[model samples]
Target chain A: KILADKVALVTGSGSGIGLAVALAYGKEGAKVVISDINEQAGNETVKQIESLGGEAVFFKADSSSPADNEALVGYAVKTFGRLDIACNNAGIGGEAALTGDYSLDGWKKVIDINFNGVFYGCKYQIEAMERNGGGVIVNMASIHGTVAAPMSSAYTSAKHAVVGLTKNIGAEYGQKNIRCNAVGPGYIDTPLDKEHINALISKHPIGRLGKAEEVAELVLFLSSDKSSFMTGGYYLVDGGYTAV
Target chain B: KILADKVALVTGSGSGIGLAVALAYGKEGAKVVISDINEQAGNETVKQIESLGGEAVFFKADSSSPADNEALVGYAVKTFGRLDIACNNAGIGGEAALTGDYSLDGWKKVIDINFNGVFYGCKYQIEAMERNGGGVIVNMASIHGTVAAPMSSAYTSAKHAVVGLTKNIGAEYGQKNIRCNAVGPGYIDTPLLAKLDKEHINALISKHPIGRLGKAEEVAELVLFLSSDKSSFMTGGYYLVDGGYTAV
Candidate 1:
């Protein structure tokens, strides 16, 4: 219960990586807020948290809208009276296209949800956290953010920008006791990509895709007080994808 | 004359690190284009290049613009009829801003000029080089891009983005015969670090195992090495010349 008495709000916690992390946060003694665009699954996540005998709730958050992002942060603050940790983990895989010929709409949609959306979350989350003395925020990026995939221009661009946005936020909030960092996951098998399992495994260098729980462990550690010295930094947890 | 008949372009070549790089490229027998935003300084660079009995010219360019970036590449193509190499070494000494006190305007400004500008340079330069079969590009980043600073969040963010951008482009186009990499310099005595002065200099020296700030030639040496065929397998890399500051 390293996180005992702390309150954490994780977006897209209904299933996949976010859900696993939500459970881990609860086990670490945090009051959790489960959110997703899918209401059916979002409520299920809450039920699971309750089944575990932990305090939890559900909220509908699109995460793509500044207003919705603000309201989501507000909901966490309102429900818990004080928010200790926030993870902007929700992101879209986006429609695919070739690097040179990717659709502009596809690019814009991905950037809006992934990059600009993260900014919106940080803008409000920092505002709320600054008043609460200090807080930790983790924005989920991907290895694609650092390495190029021939057909993933939008995802690559958004993830790269997320890295920049994370550092900017970290620098802006470090002295305020609010720490911000980015996590770039490699190929991970979450509920989001269960059906395309083979495709996920093939693209990864590790012979198979990664597990959501492993990523969850990293998020848990980063969200805790152990990472207090870390801010305006990015850590890649992708089975040695970028080590070369 | 190691680079005989090759065409090379060095940005921010009016003075300091850029100037030194241009001289190195010129001495290697390549046709060198010394580009900078400073008109008078640009002329001075041209004079310095001519003084060394090497082929040279000066082009005024705002390194922050995509169009100017394209033109810089195009200038190399027009003058030499082919683009062989590019050294992206232009950057500003950003204002000091701690995380909590950092301004959006400041962050955006540095990123636009530093990170995004480098992106545009890589984008256009790659295309031009690819059209002629192949080329090499070396981007200037900083150790701050890979590590954290108590202040300088904007510079750090932008530099980090540039590092990521370098990897993305390098990996994306490696198969196309384009070699892209970044050079992260430690504390060097350039105009960019003039503000550091004696007090800051002592503090910076304490971080270096070498116990001194690097000379402009030392950084140029790294650029030359990466730009050469000696490092053919070295695409998508961010090499550091930090005098073991990062080794710890």
Candidate 2:
């Protein structure tokens, strides 16, 4: 129970990495608030947490909306009485296209949801945590954040921005005890086409995609007191994907 | 001119990244001190810097020796009136071997020069910088700092330790105007790697997406950024310039 009695909010918890983290927090004895645009999937995550004998609630909110982000942070505090951990993990993989031919609309969508969405979450989360003493934030970046690819300019740019924002916030608020860090996951096997997954494995030395639970474990470590001295840093659990 | 009127001390500047960074600092208008165990190479670097119309001096010192590190810092301040930057870039690539088979003596030597060497430099550099108002430290860590490698257990562990030390110091003294950062360079074409056979070189080149090895000047560019106000907002950061080698 590393996070026993603590309160956590995970965005886009309807499925994938977000859901995994929400469940992990629940098992760690924290009261979890799962937010996602997909209400059905979000509620199912809550159900699974409850079946594990852990407390959790589902909130239907589109993470890209600033109003929705602020309201969700408020909701977590109103329900649990305090917010201690926040994982801004909501993001979308935009249409794969070369940088020159990339669509403007597609770029805007990914930047808004992936990059600015994290910003909106941090704005409200940091404000809320100030009154509750201090807290921790783990933003989901990607190995793409550190390196670039040909057909995914939007995703690469947004994740890179997320890392920069995490660093800025970490340095700004360390004196206040609010720690900030970004986690870069390798190609995780989610609901993707098998061909796409196979292509990803070729780039990774481990010859496999990451499990959501593996990332969750690292997130949990960053959220706990064991990482008290860590801030303004980006870590990779990418299974040697970036190790060349 | 980013470092105009500033004083910089670069350990192990006799060759490799240290030499490149020292030459870069000198060209940027800093009064540089080139410290290395190899007196011949250190003096040659000084000659090269002087030939470029930049001011520099050679100080023969072994980075593994804490006394030498202290004396180097002392000499920098004593000569230049103040010390504004310190690049703890000296390190040794230990004999490649598996963890269990790695020699105890090899491990100890690598840890001492690669890890504790940076520690010793930071210890004295921080004290001097605090006295001189503030300064910056750019530690040269390898790409191995952020990732691990096979048959190089000691090098991997020592590099990881350097990153940790960089973070601890950055957080501890950032409020006092002191900033610390670690630069993780990919496989660079240096004197140290000249002995590698063709097959080994090909294997390394294949891993790098950029289709070529990195140059010392490329790393020098990053170190200059960290030494300048352009990177003022950055500390405790391990930045990699590895030709996308680690970006897979």
Candidate 3:
């Protein structure tokens, strides 16, 4: 109940990292607003939060859209009264192809949803929170944000842009009581080929794929007063993915 | 002939600073692809290049559209047979409004066209240029990219992010023989500025330490330098073409 009575919003919370983040915030006594590009999944998240005896709302919109991001934030404030915490966690892994061969459409798709998506969320969220005199933002960057991955220029560049964007927001507004930070997750276990996930195991010095909940825990800490002194720093929950 | 038969594309080159960039590159022996929302102006750019005995092509495009950006690159490559240099220069000065009063729609429009438009251009441009074995990219940010302008938070923030994105591309692809840089222009002497009241014009000039605003072609000269081998080691950097506006 660290976030008791706080109003929190999570973008792309229909599944994956966003889902875990939304649930964690809801469990912490925060009134959660769950938005995802997928309406069905978003409704499920809201249902889950309600079943847990927490009040929650669902907003369905494409995170790649700036207008959608603006509307989503407005809806959060309108429904929950004020925005105190938010996690811009929606993103995509674009088609894996070398920079030379990466399709133009794929590059645009990934950068739009990943890089511009995060900036759009921040743009509107900062405006909403500045009025309240306090808020926190956690952008879901990835290990690829810190370092490059082969055959994934669009994804890598977009993530790096996220890190830079987080820094920009934090530098400009942290003292205004709106803190912005980025979380970089390692190779997380999800709906992917078991062999593919297994092959990446050795890349993590911790010797295992990270859980979505593990990353959620770090995001939770960043979103709370515990990390009040922290802003603009990229915190990694990568289990030493970049250690080597 | 510093460009020595290179291929270059300039977006939003129908007029203003982008048109200046097109002219400079064409004069330097680069075959230019000129794309803009205005077909007449874009075609005029092509005409000027043709008159100068330089190769050029025009594509009607709106920088705000991702698909349009992608198509522009494909069109450039199809005609030029290669891609070597580009400037993601399309942008619009959004409505002046204080941050607290800025409309969501205004902010979205500005951010989309100014910031995301630059990214969209770079996204597809980078893909084609990487295969070209070598390329240079110049993103035309504004002096506002590094400093804030009153009543213009949306435009200011987008420009800042543009500078940031330029750095990301430079860091990620510089080794691939690709270079990315941003130019931060101060207030420029343009038809838009010329039509302003004398009082307003003087107020702008007062901010320039050099006592006058910049010329479009003067800024384009710096663009030419960055596009050539002369700036081989410069990437992920934002260079100011102001009349020392930031000094004050």
Candidate 4:
């Protein structure tokens, strides 16, 4: 219970990586707010936490919408009294076209949702956390954030921008007691990697895909006082994908 | 003469880092275009490069002006026929206030000249480089780009942004034949450090794992390496030559 009694929230927390983080936060004794576009999935996560003897709430939110993000953050603040931590793990969107074939409009749209969504959450999370004195923000960027994929120019560029935003926010708001960071998780998209599983599998030195729970554990440390020395940096959990 | 006629230009090249890089580029056989706001220092440096029997030219331009940056690149393109490499190194200063007391205007001006100056150079630099196949960009960032310094929020923020920009360009234009990297140098024992108090000077020495401050030419070597094909595998990275100042 390192996060005992802390007010925490994770976006897109209905299933997959988001749910794993929300579940981990709940088990750590935080007042976890689980949000997703799917109301059924969101509410189910709340009950899952409740069954484990933890406090949780379901807030249906479209991660791409700023109003929804602000309202979701406000809900956590109002119900739990203050926001202590936030995890933004919303979207990993882009087309599979190579650089020459990719469109400007496509890049713009992808960045707005994938990159801007993280900023939207940060803007409001920082606002609420500022009022409560200080808090931690963990932005979920993909391995593509720093390392480039062959046809992922849009995703790569926007993810890189998130790092810029993360570094800036850390430098800008650290004096205000806010800690901002970005997580670059290894390749683990079940649907996306099915065709080239063997090719991508060998890329990881660890010889396997990463579990969502594994990523949640790192987030917990960063969100806690244990990582007091860390801020405005991008931490990679690529299983040696980058090292190679 | 590793550069061997490669067309290159550096901003703020009248003295200190800019001059050091220009001198090194000249000796390496690059067709060097040195730009600075001060005409006397700029022309003097041109003579120094010429005295080394290396081809060189001087362009008077302000790092803060976007138009000036473009024209500087234009001068390189017209003079040497193409632009292949560039180094953006100009200004670094803040009001010395903490995050709370820091003003927006001061922040904007500092970023505009320091960070935006790099971007402005990269903008026109990339355009010309793109025109001539591909080129390399070496942005002169500081150790503060990654590590923070007290009362230097604006500088740190903009410097970090440069790292972000460097990373993006490496990934974005790698296939297009361009490479981008940043150099973070420690307290180089430059002419500027002579004005500060000895106590301040002594305090700086202890911070570095190396017992002494770095030299401008030492930084110039790394910049030259990145500007040339020697750094084929390096891009979108911030290499620190800080004499272990940041190691601790």
How accurate locally, in lDDT, is each candidate? Answer: 0.80, 0.85, 0.84, 0.81
Question: What does the lDDT read for residue A197 in candidate 2?
Answer: 68
lDDT of 3 by residue, B1-248 (tens): 99877999999899989999999999889999999999999999999989998889999998999789889999999998889999988888888764445666886788778877887788788888877787999999888776657567667767766776677677768678989898999998889887889999999899999999899999899999998999998997889999998776
Model 2 clash pairs? Answer: A242-B246
lDDT at B235, model 4: 88
Write one digit per residue (lDDT tens) for candidate 3, span A1-244: 8889999999989888888898899899999999988899999999998988888999887888878988999999999789999999998888977554567588778877887777778878888998787799998888876566766766776776676667656766756888888899998877766687777997899989899899999999999999989987788999898777
The local lDDT score (0 to 100) that residue B97 gets in candidate 3 is: 62
lDDT (Cα, 0-100) at A154 in candidate 3: 69
Per-residue error (Å), model 2, residue A181? 18
Model 3 regions lying over 4 Å from their true place: A14-16, A23-28, A37-81, A98-112, A115-134, A142-218, A226-244, B14-16, B38-60, B64-83, B97-112, B115-134, B141-222, B232-248
| Candidate 1 off by > 4 Å | A1-4, A11-16, A23-75, A91-127, A144-182, A190-207, A225-244
Please give the DockQ score of every candidate, comma-separated: 0.30, 0.02, 0.11, 0.12
Q: Alpha-carbon error at B15 in model 2, in Å?
A: 1.2
TM-scores of chain A across the candidates, in order, are: 0.93, 0.97, 0.97, 0.94
Q: Give per-residue CA lDDT, model 1, range A1-244, as digits (tens).
A: 8999888989889888899889999888999988899999989988888898888899898887877887988998998888889888889887755333444467557756776567667777877888799899988888876777655655676687677667767766666788888888888764345666766666666777788999889889899999989987788889777776
lDDT of candidate 2 over A1-244, digit per residue (tens) = 8899999999999899999899999999999999999999999999999999999999999889999999999999999898999999999989899998999999999999999999999999999999999999999999888888668999999999999998788767756878888888887777666687678777664455778887887788678764554566677666445544
Candidate 4 CAPRI-style tier: incorrect
